[PDB]
Amino acid sequence: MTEYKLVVVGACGVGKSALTIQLIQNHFVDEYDPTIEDSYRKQVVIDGETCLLDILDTAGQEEYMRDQYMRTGEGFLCVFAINNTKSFEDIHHYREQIKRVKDSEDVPMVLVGNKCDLPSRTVDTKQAQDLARSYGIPFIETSAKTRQGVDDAFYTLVREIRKHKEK
Ligand SMILES: Nc1nc2c(ncn2[C@@H]2O[C@H](COP(=O)(O)OP(=O)(O)O)[C@@H](O)[C@H]2O)c(=O)[nH]1
Ligand SMILES: *CCC(=O)Nc1cc(C)nc(C)c1Br
Ligand SMILES: [Mg+2]
């Protein structure tokens, strides 16, 4: 089957691990070791193609040396949390990092606004839409707690990779 190398990036605490674990195990984690970085595998049918997703759940090596495992990534989920203004403001840094590791301004990428189930919103959907439009990428809101938008964010990334290269 076809392998898709996905990388999940973003500020600590936005829900990178919870989004990955919800996608793979259909379960929401109340806590997950903030320092653990690992790649997880998931076989799934997307638009009739049997795909092997190899997802790197980053812990933030550069912020806390270069992460050698990110360089082979074909697509990136850039995650902020809708109740964490700082994580949204940090999106510029992660996008610059992705451009640097791939030496390109045309990288398959999806801006993800996680924790959409929470009522303490500080990042408006229009702020995230403006940011995603300047980068030329899709913006999707998710909840790793309720699974709302989770499959869509990962499948949209797979579709963005296909849009960029033959798979
Ligand atoms: N309510 C809610 N909490 C979430 C969601 N995603 C993550 N969290 C919580 O936010 C905290 C940090 O999540 P985690 O996945 O470890 O973040 P990471 O550092 O980006 O990997 C944990 O307590 C999670 O349960 C979500 O969509 N909704
Ligand atoms: C949420 C990410 C995080 O806490 N990462 C982290 C923290 C510390 C203290 N050290 C390292 C090496 C890392 Br990746
Ligand atoms: Mg994590």
Q: Is the CB of 14 under 6 A from ligand 1?
A: yes
Q: What is the distance in A from the centroid of ligand 2 to the CA of 45?
A: 34
Domain ranges for the chain: 5-164
Q: Is 116 left (phi over 0), alpha (psi -120 to 50) or beta?
A: alpha
How many whole angstroms separate alpha carbon 44 and alpha carbon 140? 20
Tokens 């793979």 correspond to 24
How many whole angstroms separate alpha carbon 72 and alpha carbon 45? 22
| CA-based nearest residue to 76, from 110, 50, 49 | 110
Structure tokens at 127: 């702020």
How many whole angstroms separate alpha carbon 79 and alpha carbon 137? 13
Residue 3 neighbours by CB under 8 Å, 6+ apart: 51, 52, 53, 54
Q: How was this structure determined?
A: X-ray
**Is CATH 3.30.465.10 the classification given to domain 5-164?**
no
Resolution of the coordinates, Å: 2.0
Q: Are 19 and 59 in contact (CB under 8 A)?
A: no
Whose CA is closest to atom 16 on ligand 1? 32
